[PDB]
Design a protein around this ligand. Structure first.
Ligand SMILES: Nc1nc2c(ncn2[C@H]2C[C@H](O)[C@@H](COP(=O)(O)NP(=O)(O)OP(=O)(O)O)O2)c(=O)[nH]1
Ligand SMILES: [Mg+2]
Ligand SMILES: [Mg+2]
Length: 425
DNA sequence: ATTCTGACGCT
């Protein structure tokens, strides 16, 4: 009753760019705009692996993790843009720099947690208060929410339903109560519209947004109405929302843990978790997960918006599947050098931009036939931004995996250098 | 033979 907290204290938004790499390519090459198009890596093996698909191409069934040669079978007019290759590997620089454009705009409005290359979380709690005070009891007009969906509304053409649902919501709002959580989400949603307009005016990129009370619901909400739309998931929309929402759709339940929840408990949808006591959930899934499941299926999550705009690591990786696996000493050195040279270029730029230095170098490898994704992971000290030292140090730290009696055995199916443990500079 | 990352938990 009066003492059960409900997790309505914060306003949090999740903003995610629509088909991000495709839009980066469509801004640069106007011929790709408004066409079925995808972004690939490499081109020789089945036309390249697709990692970004425009919404026009998706109408034909083109998805991520698909080979371009297969996508062409579904979509014969599909236009492909290729990630830049450097030193024999894919080079994601253009998208990381495009991401920085976006993150810097978002950060003018509020503190953001960079959650991926194309998405950040936003804590709007303070911005909403400041804004609620400025409005001075003034009602909120649908004109301020031109692209907002209210989840679960209307109740009782797509743009027609959106406006109906928005009118119903706005009509019910108690505008004189500066502490009502629904009012705060609505105001949060006004700011997100502003944030999304500034991103498009200043980058040309379009995006979607989720507006709710915590990071997990904002993320879920963000996908309900992509593309170029934002969605407000209110505390009261949760029971209906979760009653048919598959467990796997919730961030962090998409894998094994969500599968064990499904299998142990004999359930399918998020809302079914509410029938289990916290202790029961803790008993099956641990004290942390259990507490987090007991609260999450009621729409409650306390994970904070971390004030972190920059990555914590900087990493370079290349897979070597199949017969291309590295089998010689010279080969493993040349690719450590290729990896280290990109890492160095990235690091020197990070130091100059962000006033910091990485202090630890992590080397990860895979050998052929090793079931695991990493056959080994070892760290050494990262004392100089010198590619030749880093690659040499990576070799020193993995050379005892070779079993050869100049040859390399087992052949390596993955090299991976990561710079970590940043310190101010 | 999607590949290339990046966060964060567990022990
Ligand atoms: N190298 C690599 N890049 C990837 C991979 N997956 C995605 N990317 C790249 C390409 C993606 O643009 C971006 C991740 O953004 P998302 O939210 O996952 N997808 P998007 O923005 O395309 O579509 P929408 O958000 O509208 O659903 O990173 C991958 O496995 N590998
Ligand atoms: Mg995206
Ligand atoms: Mg994303």
């Amino acid at each position: 009753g009066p003492h059960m907290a409900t997790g309505q204290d914060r306003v949090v938004a999740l903003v995610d760019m629509d088909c991000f790499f495709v839009q980066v390519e469509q801004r640069q090459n106007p011929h790709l705009r408004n066409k079925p198009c995808a972004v690939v890596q490499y081109k020789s093996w089945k036309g390249g692996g697709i990692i970004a698909v425009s919404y026009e191409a998706r109408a034909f069934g083109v998805t991520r993790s698909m080979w371009a040669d297969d996508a062409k079978k579904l979509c014969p007019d599909l236009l492909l843009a290729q990630v830049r290759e450097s030193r024999g590997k894919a080079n994601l620089t253009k998208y990381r720099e495009a991401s920085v454009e976006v993150m810097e705009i978002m950060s003018r409005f509020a503190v953001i947690e960079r959650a991926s290359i194309d998405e950040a979380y936003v804590d709007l709690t303070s911005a909403v208060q400041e804004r609620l005070q400025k409005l001075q009891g003034q009602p909120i007009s649908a004109d301020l929410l031109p692209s907002t969906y209210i989840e679960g509304l209307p109740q009782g053409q797509k743009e027609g339903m959106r406006k109906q649902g928005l009118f119903q919501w706005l009509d019910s709002l108690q505008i004189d109560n500066l502490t009502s959580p629904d009012l705060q989400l609505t105001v949060g949603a006004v700011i997100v519209e502003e944030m999304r307009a500034a991103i498009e005016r200043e980058t040309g990129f379009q995006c979607s947004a989720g507006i709710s009370h915590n990071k997990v619901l904002a993320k879920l909400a963000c996908g309900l109405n992509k593309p170029n739309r934002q969605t407000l998931v209110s505390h009261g929309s949760v029971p209906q929302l979760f009653s048919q929402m598959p467990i796997r759709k919730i961030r962090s339940l998409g894998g094994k843990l969500g599968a064990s929840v499904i299998e142990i408990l004999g359930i399918e949808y998020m809302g079914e978790l509410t029938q289990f006591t916290e202790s029961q959930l803790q008993s099956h899934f641990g004290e942390k997960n259990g507490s987090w499941l007991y609260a999450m299926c009621r729409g409650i999550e306390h994970d904070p918006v971390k004030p972190r705009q920059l990555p914590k690591t900087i990493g370079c990786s290349k897979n070597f599947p199949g017969k291309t696996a590295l089998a010689t000493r010279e080969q493993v050195q040349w690719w450590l050098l290729q990896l280290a040279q990109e890492l160095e270029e990235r690091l020197t730029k990070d130091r100059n931009d962000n006033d910091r230095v990485a202090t630890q170098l992590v080397v990860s490898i895979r050998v052929q036939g090793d079931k695991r994704l990493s056959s080994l992971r070892r760290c050494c000290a990262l004392t100089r931004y010198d590619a030749h030292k880093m690659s040499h140090d990576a070799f020193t730290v993995i050379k005892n995996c070779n079993t050869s009696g100049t040859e390399w055995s087992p052949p390596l199916t993955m090299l991976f250098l990561c710079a970590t443990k940043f310190s101010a500079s």
